[PDB]
Amino acid sequence: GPVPSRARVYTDVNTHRPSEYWDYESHVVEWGNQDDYQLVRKLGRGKYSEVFEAINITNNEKVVVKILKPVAAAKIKREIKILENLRGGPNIITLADIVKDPVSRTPALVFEHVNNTDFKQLYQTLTDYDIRFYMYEILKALDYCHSMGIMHRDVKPHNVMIDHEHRKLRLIDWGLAEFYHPGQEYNVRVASRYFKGPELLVDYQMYDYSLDMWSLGCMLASMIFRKEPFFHGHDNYDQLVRIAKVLGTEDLYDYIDKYNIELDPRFNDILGRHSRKRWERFVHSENQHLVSPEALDFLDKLLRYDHQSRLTAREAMEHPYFYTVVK
Numbered sequence: 001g002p003v004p005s006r007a008r009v010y011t012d013v014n015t016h017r018p019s020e021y022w023d024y025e026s027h028v029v030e031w032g033n034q035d036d037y038q039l040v041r042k043l044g045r046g047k048y049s050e051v052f053e054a055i056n057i058t059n060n061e062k063v064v065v066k067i068l069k070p071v072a073a074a075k076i077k078r079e080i081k082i083l084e085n086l087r088g089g090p091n092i093i094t095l096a097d098i099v100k101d102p103v104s105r106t107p108a109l110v111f112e113h114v115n116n117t118d119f120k121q122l123y124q125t126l127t128d129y130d131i132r133f134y135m136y137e138i139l140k141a142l143d144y145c146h147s148m149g150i151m152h153r154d155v156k157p158h159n160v161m162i163d164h165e166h167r168k169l170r171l172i173d174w175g176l177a178e179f180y181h182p183g184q185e186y187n188v189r190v191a192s193r194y195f196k197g198p199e200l201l202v203d204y205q206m207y208d209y210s211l212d213m214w215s216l217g218c219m220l221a222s223m224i225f226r227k228e229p230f231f232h233g234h235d236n237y238d239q240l241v242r243i244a245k246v247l248g249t250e251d252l253y254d255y256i257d258k259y260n261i262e263l264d265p266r267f268n269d270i271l272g273r274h275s276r277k278r279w280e281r282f283v284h285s286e287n288q289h290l291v292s293p294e295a296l297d298f299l300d301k302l303l304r305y306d307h308q309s310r311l312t313a314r315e316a317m318e319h320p321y322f323y324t325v326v327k
C-alpha cells in the first residue's frame, strides 16, 4: 500500500482544538436577512457561484454578495465554518453575513467589499517589485490558514482579489478548503487543473498544506514567465505529462517510489522519458524584466514533486526573493 505522509508543520493544531472548531457538520447556521441587501452590479462569476457588488441598507455600506449554485451550496457549512475560523486573519476575506433566498431557497455569502483592480490589467502590468510584494501578501494568508489547520486547496489568480491603489490583497473562495487532520485521506478532485499538484494527479490522498505551495509555484511561474497557464494540460493525465516535460521523469519516479504510489497501467507510454529543464529555457526578451536568480531559486523550491520537500509558507517568507520588499 502507499506510504503514509504527515505535514512537517502544524501537524496537530486541530487535535488541540475543541471539536466545534473542525466539526463543521454540527455547526448551526444563523441566517441573516436578505432584504438588508440591494444588488447593484455584477462583479464576476463561476461554475460554483455568481458575484454581485451590493449595498447593505442597514449601514449604507458596500458589500460583495456571492450566490452559491447547488454544487457549492451542498458543502456550505464547511465554507462558513472555515470563513468564521479565519475571520480577522491577515489578508483573509471577511464574511459579513449568511442569507437565503426564500423564493429559490438558494443561499448566499456576504463579504466585506474589495475595490478590485481589473484582473487582466494586473496580470499585464504588475512590475517585478509588485509580483514580490503581492506574493508576500499571499504567503501571509497561506501561513495564517495553515497555522489554523486549514488548506485552501484552490489557490490561483481567480481566488485572489487585489485593490492595487491601496496595495490590499484578499485570498477568497474558501469553498474547496478543508481541515487538515494527519493521516486523513482526502479527495484528490480539488483545485483547478493547471494548479493541481502531482500528489493529486497520481491519486495520493494523504496530502496536506504543501498542496497550496505547489499551486502558488504554478501562479508564480505563469506570472514571471508570461505563460498562462505554465503547465497547460489537456486533462488530469496530460497535466502530469506537462509537469514531467519540465521537472523531468527521474524525479517523478523517485517521488512515486518514495511513497510506493501505483500509477495507471500505461504510465511508461503516457509519461515517456523527459530530462529536467533548466529554468533559463523559459527566459525570453518579453519576460527577462521579471526573472532573477532569486525568483528562479524560490520557484525551484515550490515546484518539487515531493510535497514534503517544498518550502512551507513561513519558510517561503524568509526567502531572498523578498529581501527587496518593504516590510
Ligand SMILES: Clc1cc(C[NH2+]CCc2nc3ccccc3[nH]2)cc(Cl)c1-c1ccccc1
Pocket (backbone or CB within 6 Å): 043, 044, 045, 051, 116, 118, 119, 122, 123, 124, 126, 130, 131, 134, 135, 156, 157, 158, 159, 160, 161, 162, 219, 220, 223
Ligand atoms: Cl494574486 C493575483 C490576483 C489577480 C486578480 N485576480 C482577480 C480574481 C477575482 N476573482 C473574482 C471573482 C468574482 C469577482 C471578482 C473577482 N476577481 C491578478 C494577478 Cl496578476 C495576481 C498575481 C499573480 C501572481 C503574482 C502576483 C499577483
Ligand SMILES: Clc1cc(C[NH2+]CCc2nc3ccccc3[nH]2)cc(Cl)c1-c1ccccc1
Pocket (backbone or CB within 6 Å): 201, 202, 203, 236, 237, 238, 240, 241, 262, 263, 264, 265, 266, 267, 270, 271
Ligand atoms: Cl491501476 C491503478 C490505478 C490507480 C489510479 N491512480 C492513477 C495515477 C496515475 N496518474 C497518472 C497520470 C499520468 C500517467 C499515469 C498516471 N497514473 C491506482 C492504483 Cl492503486 C492502481 C494499481 C496499480 C497496480 C496495482 C494495483 C493498483
